[PDB]
């Protein structure tokens, strides 16, 4: 039943180095990570199923720090989201965003260079032009392989608030970007204008009650996208109905836990369509809920990430941990969903069996093909970990599942862990 996960790799070791996003490409051969420093590092799998290891493939500075003179505020270069485009040609393309700007990056391999000059040597040593009589055209010669990353398009100035989501449409033309109150629709080849399809900004900010937390396009349907709010609801929009999507087609929400923190913990941090697109998953602070898109009034499945914290919310509020934005992800077949927790724990929920396992991303097990031991938390029998001993600074916010294989990328604050199915 349970997948026997094994340590495969650890990469990394400073604030700038903290990983802020992890994303496999569509084929799964490339893995991208962003950090608070604005740097993108791409790892390529060795292709000598496939269980080859991932090695640094490209590295570039996606975003630079900038100052908003108009409002006298610094702009973080932190990379919030990375999204790969479907492979157009030999090159690779990904969208990279920070709070304000989305950049389209082309990553391409080059293995040849021009050679030959008329008026000088390769060394740069010039010669008298008077003696130059016969022309010669330069010829391309092989060179050691290198990978170059260049920014092809900049999508800037369109968002007043902080970008939280980018999502590519299935039509291969457009993608959305969502800040706290607006969702804008872009054409991948047009930077000078964008279409604001959703705007929940109230007339008077004193009356503000909801902010957008995440937005995603349906994997198959070109006209369907969802966005979630801080109030814990998900609105499904139909672009066919009308040009502007201020009217949702469906609203997903649930009707003894009415604590002071109920308003905080209910905020949805991440929403993910299943690969099939029939189910939708949302992560809030304490639970993962899976929605059938045909059932608005309640989820079909609910999983508790960490119940032992439900009594400690007071402490978590006092150290700001309660506002952590955890993510979730489906596996390729949509049978297992993975989400992170504290103390470098990450949680696997198998839908078919309804079984749980808790795994730890730690260097103590830094031996390849060594099986990870399931963890148990107790509020203490043999091998159980006390709740009070959990380190809340060790947060696994960002995780990524290989599109086809049982390979997962789990990012701690500083280190990126890669785990594989025992083979």
């Amino acid at each position: 039943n349970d997948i026997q996960w094994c340590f495969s790799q650890v990469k990394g070791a400073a604030e700038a180095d903290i990983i802020s996003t992890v994303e496999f490409n569509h084929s799964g051969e490339l893995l991208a990570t962003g950090d608070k420093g604005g740097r993108v590092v791409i790892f390529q799998q060795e292709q000598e199923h496939s269980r080859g290891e991932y090695n640094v493939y490209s590295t570039f500075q996606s975003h630079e720090p900038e100052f908003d003179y108009l409002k006298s505020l610094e702009i973080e270069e932190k990379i919030n989201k990375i999204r790969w485009l479907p492979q157009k040609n030999a090159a690779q393309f990904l969208l990279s965003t920070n709070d304000k700007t989305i950049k389209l990056w082309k990553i391409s391999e080059r293995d040849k260079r021009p050679e030959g000059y008329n008026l000088k040597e390769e060394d740069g040593r010039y010669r008298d032009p008077t003696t130059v009589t016969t022309l010669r055209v330069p010829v391309f010669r092989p060179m050691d392989l290198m990978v170059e990353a260049s920014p092809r398009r900049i999508f800037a100035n369109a968002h007043t608030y902080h970008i939280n989501s980018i999502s590519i449409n299935s039509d291969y033309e457009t993608y959305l970007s969502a800040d706290d109150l607006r969702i804008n629709l872009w054409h991948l080849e047009i930077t000078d204008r964008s279409f604001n399809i959703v705007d929940i900004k109230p007339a008077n900010m004193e009356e503000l009650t909801e902010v957008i937390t995440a937005a995603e396009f349906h994997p198959n349907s070109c006209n369907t996208f969802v966005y979630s709010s801080s109030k814990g609801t998900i609105r499904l929009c139909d672009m066919r109905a009308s040009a502007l999507c201020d009217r949702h087609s469906k609203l997903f929400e649930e009707p003894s836990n009415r604590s002071f923190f109920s308003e905080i913990i209910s905020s949805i941090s991440d929403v993910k369509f299943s690969h099939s697109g029939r189910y939708m998953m949302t992560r809030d602070y304490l639970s993962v809920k899976i929605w059938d898109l045909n059932m608005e009034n309640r989820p079909v499945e609910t999983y508790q990430v960490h119940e032992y914290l439900r009594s400690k919310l007071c402490s978590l509020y006092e150290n700001d941990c309660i506002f952590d934005k955890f993510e979730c992800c489906w596996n390729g077949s949509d049978s297992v969903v993975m989400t992170g927790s504290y103390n470098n724990f990450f949680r696997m929920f198998d839908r078919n069996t309804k079984r749980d396992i808790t795994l730890e991303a730690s260097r103590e097990n830094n031996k390849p093909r060594t099986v990870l031991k399931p963890r148990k938390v107790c509020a203490r029998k043999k091998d159980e970990i006390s709740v009070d001993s959990l380190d809340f600074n060790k947060k696994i916010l960002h995780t990524a599942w290989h599109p086809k294989e049982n390979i997962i990328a789990v990012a701690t604050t500083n280190n990126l862990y890669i785990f594989q199915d025992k083979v």
Binding site: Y161, M205, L208, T209, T213, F323
Partner: peptide
């Protein structure tokens, strides 16, 4: 204090 909604109200 740390709520994203609160930050927006303060800012604007």
């Amino acid at each position: 204090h740390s709520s994203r909604l609160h930050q927006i109200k303060q800012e604007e």
